[PDB]
Amino acid sequence: REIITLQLGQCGNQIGFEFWKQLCAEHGISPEGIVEEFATDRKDVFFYQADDEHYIPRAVLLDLEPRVIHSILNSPYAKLYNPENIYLGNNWASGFSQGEKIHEDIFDIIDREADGSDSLEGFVLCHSIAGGTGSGLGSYLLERLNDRYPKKLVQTYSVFPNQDEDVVVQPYNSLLTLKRLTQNADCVVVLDNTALNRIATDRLHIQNPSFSQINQLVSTIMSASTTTLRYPGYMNNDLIGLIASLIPTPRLHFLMTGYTPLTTDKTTVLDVMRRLLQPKNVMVSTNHCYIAILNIIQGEVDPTQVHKSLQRIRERKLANFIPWGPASIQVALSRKSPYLPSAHRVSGLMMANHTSISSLFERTCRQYDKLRKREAFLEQFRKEDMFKDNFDEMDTSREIVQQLIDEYHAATRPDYISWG
Amino acid sequence: IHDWVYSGVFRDAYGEFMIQVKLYWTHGYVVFLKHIAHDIYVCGKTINLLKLCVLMKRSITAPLAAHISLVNKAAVDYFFVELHLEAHYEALRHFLLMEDGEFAQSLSDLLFEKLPGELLNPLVLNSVLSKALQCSLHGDTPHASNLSLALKYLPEVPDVLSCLELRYKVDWPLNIVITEGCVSKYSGVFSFLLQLKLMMWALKDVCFHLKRTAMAGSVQFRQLQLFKHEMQHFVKVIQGYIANQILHVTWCEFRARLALEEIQRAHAEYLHKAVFRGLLTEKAAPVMNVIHSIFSLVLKFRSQLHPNFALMQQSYNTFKYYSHFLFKVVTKLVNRQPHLEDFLLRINFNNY
């Protein structure tokens, strides 16, 4: 059903605008919203059911001090959506306080779009971890949505920040935002800028327009994640049916992503299964076994050979898995999307709950603990000091992520029949 | 022979023609080669229907069978280019087999509010279909007409039971191809699919009861969710087995085999393969016998809804016992299939 998309921060507004351009080019949509002469499919997931099928995206843009929003403005895709839901520092404290002072009218924008919608099923946050203006503001405002609407689902698209540390409060910003992602969000998809830049230098020799290329990558990711909804498929036409298979524990909602064609410039399903089982098709960088793996595929397949593919991949025993419990690898299939150029016809995408991300969390834990012991990298924000005199919110987040690391490592153990 | 095939009027003088002649059919089948006799018997009834719209046979059968092929190809083409036979299957699949996104989860959810003194009269069953059909936007075919929500038993009643009839009605020149016994067999598998939707609704109900209390993220809370994820894995992986056998590997054939009696036997072989790989046959009956115990336990797990925390833990343990019990008896019956090889993957990865 009806899901309202949230874009915020410089990075989040970038991939949100790119993804809306992707869905405008993808379906039979003009740059004005007009249904084209080649448009059928399910068109009410983010698309406003207008009379002449002006499929207006449910896209709420809220930031302050607009820079990239001006670049969004001089475009014909500012005529695709505008139900007047577009709204005009880089620290957690500054963004937090700026979100605090104007929370009411932007939440009125939220409420107007909410009652204007037929239903509400999820909040999709276009974001990046410590995204400058996105950080602080997004954690605050995410707390406002989670308090204000406890009956909805939260998926947060963000990337792991790698800017080669310059802001020195970035582990604090990511730590507090990660606390809010634990307690005010039900799904967080994070990706490594390092591994994506490695794949970009792998397939081609371009790494310099990294923003533009990464918009293509995560726009392919998000269109592939919603393709079963936006084109008539069979299952995971709800977000919640997709989320339920991944999560055995509502604090372990952090998923690894991989994509089977690394070049775009076909063959059977067993082959792409073996490809995706390799960790070099993964977009993300002791012993770690997955909790549950699920794959979406789109392309030209043999409908009987997918049975044979699962049969051979099983009897190969090409993976490990976790001691505690019967899960599986899970196959999901949908159509190859029409009305775009179709190169490398099989494109697969994987969502897996892996314990390897606890090491990445521990890296940020060690960075935060190091800068905390040194205590010269908070820069004494007055907004942070009046917000928290003792800075024990960071201590509480470090406690939360440590409890999650403990849950990760006891889930690696067969004693997750007992407590983790 | 030269009358009934060409002019299209059946001919018999003294009753020495073997063939002799309600709905339309009154013909009765009860030297020459018998390989052409049944061909004459069917090549006449076709032409009769187009009007309403050394001793060897080498000098006889060659100018005779050359027209039988023409009559047969006109007959088979009459189905496709006029009745749109190829569209009917990929349309009935949408609704009857519930191959429709946001239709099954919109119809079943409304049905289970009653299951009861509702869903008796025809103004609530007559309105409940049109609310599910609008939520999907797959219709506006003439197969969204002839949809008929009905029943064979009214709702007056551990208890996982639900049943419903849903039919697509058919007129006469299609009744001989897609019969009213075949639509009933779609209803026969449809009952099982709807019964599964009841479980996907009950576990969703206890999942929504826990959804609203999140405030609470305590030890007793997460340990409860650990129960749910386990049962839901089983339910979705067995639904994936159904969505494999009855919906992928059988769905490849009979749109590649489709590219007068033979069309009927092709449909009847198609569905016979669909019921066989789907394990509802008597050969794979004990595999099906265990599933209702698991269903009963999932409904029990919803019923407790804490001072019954140990009770819910006990029901989860009974689910684990029967789930590991199923894998032994299906391993035991590998020696009694290629599709049953797929079943072991769904039930076991390292469940042993």
Set down the secondary structure blueprint:
This is part of a larger assembly, with chains A (420 residues) and B (352 residues).
Chain A: E1 4-7, H1 9-26, E2 47-48, E3 56-57, E4 59-62, H2 68-73, E5 86-87, H3 92-101, H4 103-116, E6 122-126, H5 137-148, E7 153-157, H6 170-183, E8 187-189, H7 193-203, H8 210-230, H9 239-246, E9 254-259, H10 269-276, E10 290-298, H11 305-316, E11 329-334, E12 347-354, H12 357-374, H13 382-387, H14 392-412
Parallel strand pairs in A: 1-4, 1-6, 4-5, 6-7, 7-8, 8-9, 10-11
Antiparallel strand pairs in A: 2-3, 9-12, 10-12
Helix pairs in contact in A: 1-8, 3-5, 5-6, 6-12, 6-14, 10-11, 12-14
Chain B: H1 34-51, H2 62-83, H3 85-95, H4 104-114, H5 125-133, E1 147-150, E2 165-168, H6 172-175, H7 182-211, H8 219-252, H9 261-277, H10 285-289, H11 291-303, H12 309-331, H13 338-347
Antiparallel strand pairs in B: 1-2
Helix pairs in contact in B: 1-2, 4-5, 4-7, 7-8, 7-11, 8-9, 8-12, 8-13, 11-12, 12-13
PDB class: cytosolic protein
Keywords: Assembly, Intermediate, Complex, cytosolic protein
Entry title: Structure of recombinant human gamma-Tubulin Ring Complex 12-spoked assembly intermediate (spokes 1-12 substoichiometric spokes 13-14)
Give an overview in words.
- In chain A, 43% of the residues lie in helices and 13% in strands.
- Chain A has helices at residues 9-26, 68-73, 92-101, 103-116, 137-148, 170-183, 193-203, 210-230, 239-246, 269-276, 305-316, 357-374, 382-387, 392-412, and strands spanning 4-7, 47-48, 56-57, 59-62, 86-87, 122-126, 153-157, 187-189, 254-259, 290-298, 329-334, 347-354.
- Chain A is globular, with a radius of gyration of 21 Å.
- Chain B is elongated.
Report a brief summary of the structure.
The structure is cut from a larger assembly and holds chains A (420 residues) and B (352 residues). Chain A contains 14 helices and 12 strands.
